[PDB]
């Protein structure tokens, strides 16, 4: 009743860093470990049941 | 004048999930709880009927 | 009363200066930024056009 | 020269999906994303300009 939706195109954009080679070549390998692996969690890690 | 009528005391709360941290001392715990984080509850499983 | 139109979107933005930093990163870290006193812009003479 | 790349890179990267599909409720977008040979990106930017 009234409304109709039609999007035309999807476009990717992202904010990269103009990375300094002097450190980034080490920093890329620094992340490349079993040890250095970064974990994320919510403030409220809640399980929902309806 | 008085119509002898009585006032109805109440409270209203909206837009707030009411949290209970599982600890015996609920305050400032979050993750590593007192009661529901004990190594005792890692051994076996128990059902919850409310 | 259904009529046809094409919108005009425009930004308002007053009372702040158009500030851009002077580094290869292009981010003001401290007072003197990277390109401010680097290898290319240090003692030599150069003349800004627009 | 640390934390500043004296060399040409890009900050914002644009690329449109090779196959887009319009259907009943969903609207798929599949594309090949490749980060530069020595670049990083924290995934809080990566959006869709619809």
């Amino acid at each position: 009743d009234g409304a109709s939706i039609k999007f035309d195109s999807i476009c990717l954009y992202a904010t990269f860093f103009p990375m300094a080679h002097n450190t980034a070549s080490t920093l890329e390998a620094m992340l490349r470990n079993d040890t250095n692996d970064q974990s994320f969690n919510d403030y409220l890690s809640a399980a929902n049941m309806l | 004048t008085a119509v002898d009528s009585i006032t109805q005391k109440k409270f209203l709360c909206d837009r707030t999930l009411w949290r209970i941290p599982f600890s015996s001392n609920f305050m400032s715990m979050g993750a590593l709880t007192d009661l529901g984080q004990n190594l005792l509850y890692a051994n076996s499983a128990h059902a919850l009927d409310m | 009363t259904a009529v046809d139109s094409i919108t005009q979107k425009k930004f308002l933005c007053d009372r702040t200066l158009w500030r851009i930093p002077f580094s290869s990163n292009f981010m003001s870290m401290g007072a003197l930024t990277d390109l401010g006193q680097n290898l290319l812009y240090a003692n030599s003479a150069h003349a800004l056009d627009m | 020269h640390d934390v500043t790349t004296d060399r040409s890179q890009r900050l914002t990267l644009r690329f449109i999906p090779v196959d887009r599909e319009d259907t009943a409720y969903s609207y798929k977008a599949r594309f090949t994303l490749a980060v530069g040979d020595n670049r990083v990106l924290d995934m809080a930017s990566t959006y869709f300009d619809i």
Partner: peptide, 24 residues
Amino acid sequence: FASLAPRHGSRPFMGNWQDIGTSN
């Protein structure tokens, strides 16, 4: 690295950091 940041008073980088976890 000690070279990596721009620091105040002739010192590269100075005060170390700590960020808090979500639950609490």
